[PDB]
């Protein structure tokens, strides 16, 4: 099974470590993000593992299939669309999801790409804003990291 | 041609950005590293893109072929063995090399792995120390980054 990891940092107090592994036919994503305002924050794979300009140089959502932005359960979603993480009142969000479009091998591998956690909630394409079908209108980028191979 | 990038940071003042691209049958590695003591500093691809424990969690040199540590021109070298960068008197080293064992695709891809710049010179396996044929006796890790996909 391939294993990957991602250490998130950015222009905010938000930190955390995300683990990714192949498990059966999906990828299991786990970890904790801290320093968040309570509530939902968008969380996606972005196309580029490029930290030359903070989290901005990560580019847009990873979208090898040319779909609109959606919810993780949708067919019409970016490969990178992992929805929201939910921070508790203490500012900490925990992840434990299984995804069928995130890959750690093959043409749609996310190795060397970026995870981003956002300022605002991801509206899952349904918020009625110009950015809804692009980004989920999730606003700016609190923290990000390049997805790397681990043991 | 695949393009990658790596932003180096660590427990030191050393920073820099490294670009990697496929060019003909090799990979071209370019960039500048700053904040170094003048002279030679070891520079390698390490196996893991894992920043959970600073540069230590990058593991050892990337060595998919089970070779000893050597010089870049050698057959008996780790795939990750890029020799030394040379910092000038102003503490800045510039890279411009072409390598045949670094890959950005296939089984030996370095996407999602780490570049490390070291405290000491890499002795290229020839220094006569116990670590020479392991690490080049290059000492600790000044800065590192995960190798990511870019445009
Ligand atoms: Cu995002
Ligand atoms: Cu090294
Ligand atoms: Zn999206
Ligand atoms: Zn080596």
């Amino acid at each position: 099974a391939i294993h990957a990891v991602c250490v998130l940092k950015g222009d905010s107090p938000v930190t955390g470590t995300i683990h990714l592994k192949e498990e059966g036919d999906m990828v299991t994503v786990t970890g904790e993000i801290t320093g968040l305002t309570p509530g939902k924050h968008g969380f996606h794979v972005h196309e580029f593992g490029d930290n030359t300009n903070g989290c901005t140089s990560a580019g847009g959502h990873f979208n090898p299939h040319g779909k609109e932005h959606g919810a993780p359960e949708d067919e019409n979603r970016h490969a990178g669309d992992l929805g929201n993480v939910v921070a508790g009142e203490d500012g900490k969000a925990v992840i434990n999801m299984k995804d069928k479009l995130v890959k750690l091998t093959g043409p749609d591998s996310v190795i060397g790409r970026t995870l981003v956690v956002h300022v605002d909630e991801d509206d899952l394409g349904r918020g009625g804003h110009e950015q809804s079908k692009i980004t989920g209108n999730a606003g700016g980028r609190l923290a990000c990291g390049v997805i790397g191979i681990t043991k």
Side-chain angles (χ1 to χ4, degrees), chain A:
Chain A
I2 295 145
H3 293 251
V5 68
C6 186
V7 172
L8 305 176
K9 301 174 181 130
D11 184 23
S12 76
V14 176
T15 61
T17 294
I18 307 297
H19 274 91
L20 306 85
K21 62 176 177 190
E22 295 182 316
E23 183 181 17
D25 293 344
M26 288 195 284
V27 169
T28 301
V29 182
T30 56
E32 183 190 51
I33 306 175
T34 66
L36 292 163
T37 58
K40 290 182 177 71
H41 295 265
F43 183 61
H44 326 102
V45 185
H46 290 235
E47 186 176 358
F48 303 123
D50 182 333
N51 188 218
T52 62
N53 186 23
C55 295
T56 296
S57 44
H61 299 181
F62 182 48
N63 190 25
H65 303 293
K67 300 299 196 186
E68 296 178 302
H69 183 75
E73 64 271 15
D74 297 344
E75 179 272 311
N76 183 23
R77 58 170 271 201
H78 303 146
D81 288 346
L82 299 175
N84 292 286
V85 300
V86 184
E89 282 305 310
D90 75 343
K92 305 191 172 184
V94 173
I95 302 85
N96 178 20
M97 59 185 59
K98 298 178 163 76
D99 196 76
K100 70 188 204 176
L101 293 186
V102 173
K103 300 293 171 205
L104 298 176
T105 190
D108 293 348
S109 184
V110 304
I111 300 297
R113 306 190 184 274
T114 289
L115 295 174
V116 177
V117 63
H118 287 271
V119 171
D120 299 319
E121 177 174 338
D122 177 343
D123 73 23
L124 312 175
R126 293 158 172 105
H129 299 269
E130 181 168 75
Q131 295 295 317
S132 298
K133 293 298 171 187
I134 311 180
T135 69
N137 195 37
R141 304 179 183 191
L142 292 166
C144 60
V146 185
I147 301 167
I149 297 167
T150 194
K151 56 184 159 144

